[PDB]
From a paper:
IAV strains are named according to the antigenic similarity or serotype of two major viral surface glycoproteins, hemagglutinin (HA or H) and neuraminidase (NA or N), which also play key roles in binding and release, respectively, from receptors on airway epithelial cells. Influenza HAs bind sialic acid (N-Acetylneuraminic acid, NeuAc) containing glycans (sialoglycans) on cell surface glycoproteins and glycolipids as their primary biological receptors.
Interestingly, from the late 1970s through to the early 1990s (strains Bgk/79 to Shn/93), a marked decreased in binding to N-linked and biantennary O-glycans containing only one or two LacNAc repeats beneath the terminal sialoside is evident.
Numbering used by the authors:
A (entry chain B), B (entry chain B), C (entry chain B): 1 to 172
D (entry chain A), E (entry chain A), F (entry chain A): 9 to 325
The structure:
Amino acid sequence: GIFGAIAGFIENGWEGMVDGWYGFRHQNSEGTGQAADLKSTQAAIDQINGKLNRVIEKTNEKFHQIEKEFSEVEGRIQDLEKYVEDTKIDLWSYNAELLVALENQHTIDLTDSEMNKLFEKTRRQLRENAEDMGNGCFKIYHKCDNACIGSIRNGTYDHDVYRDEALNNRFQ
Amino acid sequence: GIFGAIAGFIENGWEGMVDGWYGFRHQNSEGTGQAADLKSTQAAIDQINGKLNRVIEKTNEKFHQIEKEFSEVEGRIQDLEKYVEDTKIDLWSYNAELLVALENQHTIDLTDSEMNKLFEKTRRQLRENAEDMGNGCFKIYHKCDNACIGSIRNGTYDHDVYRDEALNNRFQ
Amino acid sequence: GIFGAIAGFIENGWEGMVDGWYGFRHQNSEGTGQAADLKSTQAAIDQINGKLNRVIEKTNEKFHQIEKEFSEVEGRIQDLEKYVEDTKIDLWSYNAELLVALENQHTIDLTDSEMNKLFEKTRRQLRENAEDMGNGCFKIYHKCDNACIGSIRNGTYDHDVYRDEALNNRFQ
Amino acid sequence: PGATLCLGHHAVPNGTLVKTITNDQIEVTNATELVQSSSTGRICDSPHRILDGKNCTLIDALLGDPHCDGFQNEKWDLFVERSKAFSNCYPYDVPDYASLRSLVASSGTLEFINEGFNWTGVTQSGGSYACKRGSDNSFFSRLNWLYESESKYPVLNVTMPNNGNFDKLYIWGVHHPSTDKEQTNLYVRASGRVTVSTKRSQQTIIPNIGSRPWVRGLSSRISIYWTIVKPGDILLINSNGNLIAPRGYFKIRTGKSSIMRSDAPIGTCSSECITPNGSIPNDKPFQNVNKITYGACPKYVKQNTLKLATGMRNVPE
Amino acid sequence: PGATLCLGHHAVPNGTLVKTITNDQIEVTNATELVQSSSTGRICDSPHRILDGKNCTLIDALLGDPHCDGFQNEKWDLFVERSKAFSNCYPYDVPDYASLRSLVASSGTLEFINEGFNWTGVTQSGGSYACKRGSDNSFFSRLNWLYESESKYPVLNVTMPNNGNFDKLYIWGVHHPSTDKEQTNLYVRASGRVTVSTKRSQQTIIPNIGSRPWVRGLSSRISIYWTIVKPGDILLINSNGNLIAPRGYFKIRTGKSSIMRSDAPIGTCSSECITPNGSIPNDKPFQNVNKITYGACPKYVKQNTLKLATGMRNVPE
Amino acid sequence: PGATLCLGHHAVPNGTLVKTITNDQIEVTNATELVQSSSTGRICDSPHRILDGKNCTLIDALLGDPHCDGFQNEKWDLFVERSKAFSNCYPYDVPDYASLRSLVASSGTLEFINEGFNWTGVTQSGGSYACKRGSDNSFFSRLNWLYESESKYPVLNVTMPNNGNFDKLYIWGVHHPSTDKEQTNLYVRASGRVTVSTKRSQQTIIPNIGSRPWVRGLSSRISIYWTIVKPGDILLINSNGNLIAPRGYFKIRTGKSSIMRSDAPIGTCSSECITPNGSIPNDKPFQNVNKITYGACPKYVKQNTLKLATGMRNVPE
Ligand SMILES: *[C@@H]1O[C@H](CO)[C@@H](O[C@@H]2O[C@H](CO)[C@@H](O[C@@H]3O[C@H](CO[C@H]4O[C@H](CO)[C@@H](O)[C@H](O)[C@@H]4O)[C@@H](O)[C@H](O[C@H]4O[C@H](CO)[C@@H](O)[C@H](O)[C@@H]4O)[C@@H]3O)[C@H](O)[C@H]2NC(C)=O)[C@H](O)[C@H]1NC(C)=O
Ligand SMILES: *[C@@H]1O[C@H](CO)[C@@H](O[C@@H]2O[C@H](CO)[C@@H](O[C@@H]3O[C@H](CO[C@H]4O[C@H](CO)[C@@H](O)[C@H](O)[C@@H]4O)[C@@H](O)[C@H](O[C@H]4O[C@H](CO)[C@@H](O)[C@H](O)[C@@H]4O)[C@@H]3O)[C@H](O)[C@H]2NC(C)=O)[C@H](O)[C@H]1NC(C)=O
Ligand SMILES: *[C@@H]1O[C@H](CO)[C@@H](O[C@@H]2O[C@H](CO)[C@@H](O[C@@H]3O[C@H](CO[C@H]4O[C@H](CO)[C@@H](O)[C@H](O)[C@@H]4O)[C@@H](O)[C@H](O[C@H]4O[C@H](CO)[C@@H](O)[C@H](O)[C@@H]4O)[C@@H]3O)[C@H](O)[C@H]2NC(C)=O)[C@H](O)[C@H]1NC(C)=O
Ligand SMILES: CC(=O)N[C@@H]1[C@@H](O)[C@H](O[C@@H]2O[C@H](CO[C@]3(C(=O)O)C[C@H](O)[C@@H](NC(C)=O)[C@H]([C@H](O)[C@H](O)CO)O3)[C@H](O)[C@H](O)[C@H]2O)[C@@H](CO)O[C@H]1O
Ligand SMILES: CC(=O)N[C@@H]1[C@@H](O)[C@H](O[C@@H]2O[C@H](CO[C@]3(C(=O)O)C[C@H](O)[C@@H](NC(C)=O)[C@H]([C@H](O)[C@H](O)CO)O3)[C@H](O)[C@H](O)[C@H]2O)[C@@H](CO)O[C@H]1O
Ligand SMILES: CC(=O)N[C@@H]1[C@@H](O)[C@H](O[C@@H]2O[C@H](CO[C@]3(C(=O)O)C[C@H](O)[C@@H](NC(C)=O)[C@H]([C@H](O)[C@H](O)CO)O3)[C@H](O)[C@H](O)[C@H]2O)[C@@H](CO)O[C@H]1O
Ligand SMILES: *[C@@H]1O[C@H](CO)[C@@H](O[C@@H]2O[C@H](CO)[C@@H](O[C@@H]3O[C@H](CO)[C@@H](O)[C@H](O)[C@@H]3O)[C@H](O)[C@H]2NC(C)=O)[C@H](O)[C@H]1NC(C)=O
Ligand SMILES: *[C@@H]1O[C@H](CO)[C@@H](O[C@@H]2O[C@H](CO)[C@@H](O[C@@H]3O[C@H](CO)[C@@H](O)[C@H](O)[C@@H]3O)[C@H](O)[C@H]2NC(C)=O)[C@H](O)[C@H]1NC(C)=O
Ligand SMILES: *[C@@H]1O[C@H](CO)[C@@H](O[C@@H]2O[C@H](CO)[C@@H](O[C@@H]3O[C@H](CO)[C@@H](O)[C@H](O)[C@@H]3O)[C@H](O)[C@H]2NC(C)=O)[C@H](O)[C@H]1NC(C)=O
Ligand SMILES: *[C@@H]1O[C@H](CO)[C@@H](O[C@@H]2O[C@H](CO)[C@@H](O)[C@H](O)[C@H]2NC(C)=O)[C@H](O)[C@H]1NC(C)=O
Ligand SMILES: *[C@@H]1O[C@H](CO)[C@@H](O[C@@H]2O[C@H](CO)[C@@H](O)[C@H](O)[C@H]2NC(C)=O)[C@H](O)[C@H]1NC(C)=O
Ligand SMILES: *[C@@H]1O[C@H](CO)[C@@H](O)[C@H](O)[C@H]1NC(C)=O
Ligand SMILES: *[C@@H]1O[C@H](CO)[C@@H](O)[C@H](O)[C@H]1NC(C)=O
Ligand SMILES: *[C@@H]1O[C@H](CO)[C@@H](O)[C@H](O)[C@H]1NC(C)=O
Ligand SMILES: *[C@@H]1O[C@H](CO)[C@@H](O)[C@H](O)[C@H]1NC(C)=O
Ligand SMILES: *[C@@H]1O[C@H](CO)[C@@H](O)[C@H](O)[C@H]1NC(C)=O
Ligand SMILES: *[C@@H]1O[C@H](CO)[C@@H](O)[C@H](O)[C@H]1NC(C)=O
């Protein structure tokens, strides 16, 4: 939420996008289309798998410990054994609760970030040939058929080819 | 501080804004004005109240424990009782110190974020009719009376109505 | 990584920049140059030194404690002494591991942020006289000799002086 | 022919400094305190059942020291021991005093059921001027000082089965006379022995004759011991002298009761969290009042202040 | 004459709620569970060496209670004590039972080496009908009940040096007769004494004559004690009556062995983490099954669920 | 007719790998080490007062073993016990050795004040060839071995009030003879008894006659005990034999003193943090040298390295 893309200027997600986390929808002279962006998708997945691998990193191995259940009342020493264990459990429970809260806050922000990064990358490709409509969409001011849209999706769009046509349409 | 709006490209806060956390000041043909933006204000407040509710979530309830003050020297068992409690207190003190540091760092960044989001939302509304002056202000290149400014503040500004007038003023 | 500047739209770092963390490289009519930006450099250093000072803030001072190594088998009380210490060490080891992970994630993001802030500050100075080429570079559409480049680096560039020349070159 | 539209944020003239990951002191518009550092100084008498021990420690109310007679069969969530408490009966010691105090405190009741032990052959209800009850020499109300009858003290061998469905706590004792004349006068034999056993456990205590420092009139002592008997188990008391017998058992319960050392007065108010300094509110997550607490309490920490930011950075002009 | 290009992200129809710093419940596209909350109910017999105690506690297998004869010289990583276990030999107590159980459990072996103690002047291998082995009155297999020979009991004074390079655990005992006739019949003298010493330590136990509650045929008891002897040190046993002698020593080891109270059945599977409820997987960092565990285990926490987000915020239309 | 202006950041040819929330290994331009993992191997003699025990344990310096005479009335912040230490006086044991060592170590002083106990009727200053002081048979300097005078040993009954304003630590003992002839020769009576009491506490120890393993010439032993007496309280020592009497009291203090087992040599340097490996710097927040520490120390952790990034991601070309 901290970049304002997901659940922000992008109104909602696409349930019909099943082959990626992020991607492109277009409308042009030949129709409409949808395509997943694999690099941004993979960047967010790699980060989430990294944090998952860290959280499950290593299992403490413990053997003989102290007793934790008691059938007889004893007083002082049993009070201390119980207090030590209860103290330990409360602190680990705190660590677990905080860990998940921090990680989940960070996961929501990093995935929002990757969405924003793809948007900013696309904006920069388009240079003076498109305008940001404010809802995650670019209005592209020149004829842009399927190969042209494809060139934008794979980072090879040449803005100079269309600049004259786009400037003419943009400025009356 | 991480987005560079608050204490960054916005030079300072407005002590005279008393009905909101974020908002708009304008100068036009009819005078000057100030108005709070409630949605951004409320978004930051909701987040801060969420973190406050979590920090105060549940009070551990403890009953019979161990003794923690002693009138007689005893040696080994008393050493251990004291060490257990001192160990516990130091760890909770660490948790409390870290919690407040992390939360306060995050609160400063989220409020900076909400300021940036409102700025970016306004920029996107204005399309080709204004330019970013670099200090949180837009220079609007067309006559924009009080209703027009109001339309920007409530998200109904129609950039097409003014585009011809704005382009003419922008480009000589 | 969360802003997408460092290790993102800026392809790589500059090993030859030895007098600052961030800065400017230019090409113009008089040649090429490199200059460090001290304010952004200092802002990131100040933050890192702040977090370093906090991590080393205060050394707990402990005196008489419990025994932690034993030459004789004893059973219950020794089990508890060992368990208390092992419990403590595992929790401090957890705190240390988490602290460094969180701090390092934050340091990478704050330094990325400062790079983005300098880029955004420069973009805003240039107004309509330059375009973002998508790789951290601005194409400046007017003659901009060494003093002019210097004016951009020290925040005194006057975009109005060059706007007519720049608009003419930008739009055919 | 145009307009200017400026985006911005509020500020306050009176900001407050907070700590962050990167800054020891940075000013935000507002903050809230997370460490409870004050107390009204009163222990609220709701919602927990407070029993003010007044002049009595828990152990003296257990044994039945005469000035503690008002505590017979009492209950509590929190027993409050006052620093002015004093013993005023037969001078005594409890090996593992701390443990007996703890297990009774945690049980939360002095509910006592008399049992008819068969003390045929001995005299009962020995007394002492160190332990007066009104006008008469007396003794701990829950203990039974046995001694010779018609110049004999037979080997006592008595039993008390636990045929109920709950645990029984027995408090008993051993008398340490100060001289050999006392020993033979009270128990005939030159030395006594007290053995208290169950199916699974046993305790034998041998008394020791000799002078101790004069306390409340006496150089002799008694030593207090305890035995728990589970359902289906049996108490067996075996002695040839110096036995300080139980008169019955205390019902042991489990639950949330405890004990606190405090001189704070008790007031009419409600508070979930009790410290020896008095009750404290529990709206904050941490507290610096006292590491000793009872109830639903904030966690004790060393810091006396921790400010949580509740607003943006304060950037005045 | 143009096109529209929209950037966006996926969503799912079935999101899952998670907690964050700022939100008690926010929907993400997916999450994974971090708290292990279930068990198959079986203790996997790999990779740790499980020894099912069955009807025997560890201490009864140590001492050599006849129905525990099958445990002689056994080893284990984890000794599992069943709630149906029972003693069926001479009624006994162990002062500091918990500690002896612990140090043997942690040692992980009942390996026993006989030693030829010089018991000249006494009869050996006393038995009792409370401790039958097949058809015959018998006794704890690792203990040696000494008593008078030809109506005398001389002052026993025997030694056993530790000339090896490892520690020796000696289990020994003291007999508490129920009557004076038993005492004189078995040990001649009116009261016994058992002293077990090393160069650096000593223990003296005085037996106590008297009735205890009838258990398995008897009102008498034995009390169990233990002594460790390091290399170069010497065991010296000195007694004038009531000695329950060791027959040798147990080899003490260090390592990863332990003991667990559980009624869960043992199965053919492999699992690093064992709880009294059964083995549990250890792919999650936390668990809410049991604070008692053995092996490579998740950490016990109070929460029964903690969801880690593995996807973005879910924003459907 | 234009220019290009590129924004950018530095890099280094020699980056360093760090851990993050999302990355086990990511390269940054610089990092700093947070775990102290080395020691010079020397215990710095400033700023804490180090007392090298050399051949003496703390308890042997307390009791007054002759080769420990140089430690009389010593003070320390940290008493360092060497592994080569040895006892060379009467063979002894301390029940709860660990606790007496701890309370003296924490007190930080062996300051001893002689008191004139009234030992009328007994001979004082018994000695032994196991405890030579120069040419003469001797004994622990702070203890007073009492025995018969003119073939009698009367019931000793002596008192020592605490009329000062500070606590007194008394060290006393009980002699265990190896044979009955020793017992009667030294104390006339066939068995002794030592009772040490205050207003509120009492200890009775019965000696035990018999052989222990030969140590430094002897099969007998002494057992060491201790009693603290608060202001307004009184010490009363009552014995009919085998008493090893105190010669006075040790002043008990509270403060920051402690004790450490270490063979590290002491050097001329200053260091706030002491480990048994030697002093360590305390500029880092954590350390992996030793869980045993004294002073202002980093916190012990299992990791031997933790790198804190002090620079941006390193992105070379
Ligand atoms: C082993 O050694 C100890 C120590 O010497 C002996 O213990 C002492 O025993 C005597 C009894 O013979 C005790 O004497 C009693 O002292 C009581 C305490 O008095 C204090 O308070 C008054 C003011 O009220 C002060 O003036 C006084 O100095 C004390 O500070 C008195 O209350 C007793 O007096 C009452 O009885 C006597 C009759 O004996 C009358 O004369 C008095 O007027 C009054 O009615 C009494 O004097 C003494 O306290 C014990 N000391 C300790 C330390 O315990 C043991 O007796 C001895 N054992 C053997 C077997 O000999
Ligand atoms: C100190 O005081 C105690 C308590 O009074 C005495 O201890 C008792 O001693 C007697 C022995 O004289 C014990 O009696 C024995 O009880 C056994 C337990 O029986 C239980 O189970 C049966 C059913 O199987 C029930 O009917 C019964 O009520 C009990 O619940 C019996 O097994 C014994 O009986 C066998 O032997 C006798 C011969 O004596 C035969 O008559 C029987 O048929 C059978 O073969 C026996 O009766 C009694 O249990 C002890 N009680 C306790 C609490 O320990 C001490 O003796 C006394 N000390 C001294 C020195 O006097
Ligand atoms: C109960 O049972 C124990 C064990 O049997 C008896 O304890 C033994 O008592 C005897 C005394 O009669 C002790 O004998 C002494 O041993 C000392 C240790 O010597 C060691 O070192 C030498 C080398 O220096 C080795 O050669 C030797 O083997 C030992 O390893 C010696 O120092 C003593 O010798 C000195 O005195 C004798 C005079 O008796 C001279 O002959 C010698 O030359 C020398 O001057 C002495 O021999 C023995 O150590 C004890 N053993 C243990 C394990 O304690 C108890 O006595 C017995 N109790 C009763 C009441 O009988
Ligand atoms: C039994 C009796 O009456 N003995 C006479 C004593 O008064 C006197 O010794 C005096 O004893 C005083 C304390 O006496 C009691 C007491 O503690 O009050 C008297 C109690 O009735 C008695 N109780 C029983 C069950 O015997 C009790 C008991 O013996 C002891 O407490 C055991 O330790 O003693 C006080 O100590 C006086 O200082 C002392 O002089 C003797 C000899 O003087 O005469 C007896 O007639
Ligand atoms: C020694 C003997 O045979 N004594 C006869 C007893 O049978 C009888 O008292 C009866 O004793 C019963 C228990 O007897 C044993 C036992 O525990 O089995 C018999 C053992 O052989 C004996 N072992 C040794 C080494 O002496 C053992 C021992 O004395 C005790 O366990 C010590 O506490 O006792 C049972 O208790 C009966 O209830 C009881 O009547 C006596 C008198 O009746 O006659 C003896 O001939
Ligand atoms: C008292 C005395 O001189 N006895 C003679 C003994 O020398 C001898 O038994 C020998 O005793 C040796 C140890 O003797 C001492 C000692 O420990 O040095 C002598 C001390 O003066 C004496 N101290 C006191 C206050 O009595 C001390 C004491 O009795 C014991 O330590 C108590 O346990 O004993 C050594 O053990 C020899 O091995 C032993 O033969 C006897 C009989 O031989 O003759 C006595 O004249
Ligand atoms: C709640 O009650 C606790 C316990 O009584 C208070 O803590 C105690 O505070 C006193 C302050 O008077 C400490 O005693 C003093 O220590 C200084 C040195 O620090 C010394 O110079 C004085 O002579 C005096 O001894 C005492 O150590 C301390 N006790 C504990 C266990 O920490 C606390 O102040 C009370 N808090 C509130 C909010 O009422
Ligand atoms: C694993 O085994 C442990 C230990 O047996 C289980 O914990 C135990 O759960 C029972 C639930 O039946 C608790 O007993 C019950 O408590 C309620 C009140 O909470 C009471 O009304 C019932 O009459 C009964 O006494 C028991 O306290 C608890 N024991 C401990 C030590 O916490 C646990 O449920 C098992 N977990 C799994 C996943 O199998
Ligand atoms: C500081 O001193 C401590 C304590 O002496 C050192 O820790 C000890 O390190 C030794 C390494 O020689 C450990 O002993 C060895 O263990 C291995 C198996 O791990 C075994 O194969 C060897 O035969 C030997 O027994 C010892 O367990 C360990 N002690 C403790 C209590 O952990 C530490 O290395 C020293 N650190 C520095 C920086 O000097
Ligand atoms: C979403 O999360 C669920 C549950 O955390 C994942 O389901 C697991 O999938 C793996 C791999 O197929 C299986 O081995 C597990 O048994 C599944 N666990 C459960 C509880 O069902 C799921 O794969 C995740 N990913 C997606 C895209 O749904
Ligand atoms: C990068 O980190 C290293 C090591 O953390 C720094 O080296 C330290 O420099 C200080 C100041 O000159 C010395 O006092 C330390 O002794 C050095 N430590 C080590 C381990 O070499 C270095 O200064 C940091 N900065 C740069 C720019 O490299
Ligand atoms: C990018 O897309 C264009 C248009 O579809 C295609 O011709 C070209 O081969 C692609 N290049 C890369 C590097 O993907
Ligand atoms: C927005 O403001 C304009 C101008 O003041 C007003 O006419 C219109 O009703 C407003 N609409 C909404 C949805 O707030
Ligand atoms: C900025 O740079 C220009 C051009 O080099 C120079 O003339 C001017 O003095 C500088 N001003 C400041 C404030 O640095
Ligand atoms: C009580 O004990 C006496 C003496 O042992 C005995 O005679 C009597 O039967 C027992 N029971 C009752 C109820 O008196
Ligand atoms: C065993 O003890 C007896 C009696 O003390 C003794 O005579 C004998 O020599 C000792 N040794 C052996 C091997 O019998
Ligand atoms: C010491 O004790 C003796 C014997 O009990 C006694 O006679 C004497 O008065 C006491 N006091 C002094 C100072 O000798």
